[PDB]
Symmetry: C3
Subunit: 222 residues, 3 copies
């Protein structure tokens, strides 16, 4: 179509779709109660992203936001996607390390604030304020990464896989506030099609790649 | 009023209301921890539907959607209703069979995708796309029914009641994608008042009738 | 700014902000699994309110609602705030008394109906109907307070702290339906700036003061 970013949305849609079907088939047969939780989460996440990418592709998950005296196309559906997939993702890490519930609630709450304020920032019409919400969102992100890095005796296999996905999480999650800032959502330093491309690549990395790593570990089996 | 479907919304409102009060009174005295969960769920579900039916009756839970070059009255509040009551309903069946958490998360997630994409379909302005979302929603439904049918040793009483409500669930839930397709939401083969009538009858069946069956079983008691 | 209520929104923002940082620092070091849940909740609640107060201060968490032939400024973000903080608050009391899950689900469900119908009331354009939703919301509140008062052997310390926060909860929560009724949201007997002032004072009392009392108790430690 007329939206140059469509190809990234179509590609994103296809890969989340393919990832969902992979994990869906991959998850067949799994009877270990613990393995099943990781499979459920890891299958659900790209299943949601699939529907959210398709809504952006079809034009539903997009709105227009006035700021800078300009009409800025804001794919709100990315935030809806993140609002559900990032706590699931954290759930993966919490179950991994048998996190305390209080810590999980801390993380999921901080996460909802993270996406919620990033959405608010994305939809805020007063340009300067966009970055106040960015800053607060980023602070919630930093809290989360802090908890994950310096909070989260497990078996060596758990500790081992946790360290991998933990380092993946930091680099990956940290890229999102940077893509937003430089992208058409924030400072408009990079145009929307490039920004969509970037977020697509991070999302598929976070929602299929991350799952491929997790589900490759015996750490998910009790 | 001027909306011919009002009587079905008024009737739906009254019966969910009456059902809530019934289960509320019925639930008094129940001290068994397990029985209390089934009562909580089974009381909450029509309590929510009551508020959602009343919002449709009063005109709040309704929006207008352009497609087919027509202004289509979409009772979005039915989806809000379903978004909360159908996982509760699944919760009833999961607790029944002592489902694994991973399986519950699978089900609740698939359920949210089911209602979420059905809502998206209901609000989609490009007519053809309405049915893409229908198809995806229906696929999530089929997944759920698959899990419930061929996934979900329990006591004979549990197995017995599970089989009943399971068969009820399949026929009942399966009717919804058919009513949407033929109704003014989808192909416009049946007009809105008839479609509302149909959904009211299914909702009261799913939100009061189903609860009457469940709460009639000793299966809910530990 | 031009909104006379801003100072109450700015003050509310500052105090929820200060409260969050206090509990955040206060919560450092806590390793007791149980204490951590109370800290997580009690820190998250004003963290959310902080973001919600700031959204009202900046003008994002506000919409205009036609009724009485007037344009009524409705701070929808207060309801978003409440929708998340009041179940957390109930969670605090449930964990306190080791509530049955069925009872918690009952409470959280009734709570969502409470805020959900109060939001619907706040956004309802037919003036009379505003109070039908108020009445239903209030009935859900009364249910909750009923459960908390005459439903919720614990150690004397638990029973002791529960009784305090329980009495706090009744007086505090009960003030909200009164402030809405007399405030510009309901009968317009008290103007919006006064109404905002009132809700700010209740919110800080409920979201920082209540937490200061809870976190002051050894009842939160296993
Ligand atoms: C707790 C724990 C966490 C606390 C979170 C702190 C921050 C809360 C964020 C709140 C923001 C809510 C957004 C919405 C209510 C705002 C409504 O007005 C907006 C502009 O003023 C919408 O504009 C145009 C509309 C745009 C579309 C936005 C829709 C978005 C959808 C996100 C929810 C998903 C829906 C899934 C339902 C199926
Ligand atoms: C610790 C603190 C409390 C954290 C909160 C910080 C508040 C955020 C600051 C935003 C505000 C100061 C800047 C507002 C934009 C300003 C640079 C330009 C003003 O309007 C611009 C010119 O009309 C809009 O066009 C567009 C020009 C844009 C291309 C430039 C806007 C850049 C934005 C600011 C980016 C902030 C990060 C670079 C700083 C990282 C920390
Ligand atoms: C802790 C940090 C907050 C620092 C306080 C700053 C004060 C805000 O600036 C005022 C200038 O009179 C508001 O005027 C500007 C008019 C507008 C009002 C701006 C107030 C908001 C910007 C409040 C700023 C808080 C933001 C939060 C940033 C992330 C935080 C969690 C580190
Ligand atoms: C994603 C961009 C496109 C690519 C730009 C560069 C990617 C960064 C990858 C390199 C990093 C790898 C992390 C360290 C490695 C070894 C870590 O293992 C540790 C030893 O036990 C375990 O936890 C140790 C914790 C460690 C985790 C800390 C990671 C750091 C995060 C780096 C942020 C990036 C910058 C944002 C990218 C750009 C778009 C702004
Ligand atoms: C996870 C697990 C599950 C993942 C779900 C996958 C699909 C996500 C669906 C999302 C859809 C969200 C709807 C909303 C954000 C869309 C906003 O714009 C719409 C049209 O573009 C609204 O139109 C007109 C407005 C109409 C009104 C729609 C409101 C609806 C409300 C549903 C939420 C309920 C609110 C209860 C709060 C109390
Ligand atoms: C396995 C697949 C991926 C599943 C996804 C399938 C995609 C859905 C197909 C929808 C699209 C092909 C059809 C679009 C409507 C088309 C029949 C008519 C085109 O416009 C009509 C005439 O202007 C609109 O008026 C109104 C005319 C309407 C009364 C007719 C519309 C019917 C609709 C299609 C109904 C689909 C189910 C009947 C098929 C069950 C599977
Ligand atoms: C697996 C199944 C998906 C089959 C792929 C189909 C390809 C879509 O058709 C293209 C024709 O060039 C899109 O053009 C049409 C323009 C528009 C783009 C349509 C693309 C979407 C229809 C993607 C279709 C997926 C839908 C999902 C249906 C339910 C699925 C879970 C079985
Ligand atoms: C609801 C409409 C208004 C009425 C149209 C017909 C209603 C269907 C009721 C008959 C069916 C009854 C199900 C089978 C019975 C016996 C099942 O018990 C089994 C033996 O252990 C247990 O699980 C066995 C699982 C079994 C469950 C499979 C049920 C099938 C579902 C039939 C779909 C219907 C068609 C949709 C209705 C119409 C509106 C499209
Ligand atoms: C279960 C358990 C509980 C069952 C609850 C029973 C009552 C359900 C209430 C529902 C109401 C949903 C509100 C919204 C869908 C209504 C959409 O249209 C409104 C006017 O018709 C919005 O007007 C103008 C828009 C205004 C803005 C309203 C947004 C509000 C946001 C509340 C959700 C929060 C979002 C956080 C996402 C981050
Ligand atoms: C047990 C029952 C089912 C509970 C449900 C009760 C339904 C709620 C009743 C609302 C309806 C009867 C009253 C509608 C407002 C009416 C007083 C005035 C009519 O319009 C007014 C004059 O044009 C609007 O201006 C503004 C005038 C306003 C300042 C006056 C409106 C007052 C409102 C009603 C307040 C209700 C509580 C005082 C009663 C407590 C119970
Ligand atoms: C908040 C307003 C600004 C101030 C107006 C008056 C505040 C009310 C505070 C006094 C009350 C104190 C509660 C009783 C005390 C002793 C209770 O301890 C009991 C002995 O075990 C334990 O549970 C016993 C349960 C007890 C709890 C019942 C409390 C009652 C609630 C009173 C409602 C208030 C009226 C609304 C205020 C106004 C704005 C409408
Ligand atoms: C361990 C196995 C079986 C791996 C195969 C993965 C297949 C699943 C579906 C396709 C997507 C997954 C690949 C993960 C890679 C990412 C981090 C990002 C790649 C995105 C872009 C397309 C190029 C890569 C492909 C492998 C599709
Ligand atoms: C087991 C007992 C006590 C049963 C009595 C149920 C009473 C509760 C409130 C009213 C509604 C419930 C009836 C369930 C029946 C449905 C499947 C659908 C009937 C809807 C339409 C009205 C006609 C039936 C009535 C019984 C109200
Ligand atoms: C037990 C200790 C350390 C108490 C100190 C609390 C400090 C935290 C942040 C500021 C707010 C908290 C005070 C709670 C009081 C309320 C019930 C309402 C007071 C609101 C208005 C401002 C005046 C009071 C202040 C103490 C800020
Ligand atoms: C899809 C899955 C994941 C891992 C996405 C991660 C999302 C974030 C870490 C987003 C963070 C944001 C911040 C910190 C500030 C700007 C707004 C964002 C929501 C993009
Ligand atoms: C109220 C309670 C229940 C049991 C309602 C069930 C709802 C569904 C099974 C709805 C399914 C839909 C699908 C499959 C596709 C069209 C959109 C719907 C959301 C109606
Ligand atoms: C912020 C924290 C808390 C304790 C707020 C409590 C909120 C309520 C008890 C609100 C109740 C309402 C009712 C009963 C009817 C009018 C609408 C309200 C949502 C204000």
């Amino acid at each position: 179509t007329g939206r140059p970013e469509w190809i990234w949305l179509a590609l994103g849609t296809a890969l989340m779709g393919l990832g969902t079907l992979y994990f869906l088939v991959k998850g067949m047969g799994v009877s270990d109660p613990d393995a099943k939780k990781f499979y459920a989460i890891t299958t659900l996440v790209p299943a949601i992203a699939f529907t959210m990418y398709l809504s952006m592709l079809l034009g539903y998950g997009l709105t227009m936001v006035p700021f800078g005296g300009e009409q800025n196309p804001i794919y709100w559906a990315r935030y809806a996607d993140w609002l559900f997939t990032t706590p699931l993702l954290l759930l993966d890490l919490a179950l991994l390390v048998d996190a305390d519930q209080g810590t999980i609630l801390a993380l999921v709450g901080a996460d909802g604030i993270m996406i919620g304020t990033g959405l608010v920032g994305a939809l805020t019409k007063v340009y300067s304020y966009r970055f106040v919400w960015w800053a607060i969102s980023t602070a919630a992100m930093l809290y989360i990464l802090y908890v994950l890095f310096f909070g989260f005796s497990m078996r060596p296999e758990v500790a081992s896989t946790f360290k991998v996905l933990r380092n993946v999480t930091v680099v990956l999650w940290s890229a999102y506030p940077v893509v937003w800032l430089i992208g058409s959502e924030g400072a408009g330093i990079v145009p929307l099609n490039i920004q969509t491309l970037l977020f697509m690549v991070l999302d598929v990395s976070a929602k299929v790649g991350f799952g491929l790593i997790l589900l490759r570990s015996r750490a998910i089996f009790g």
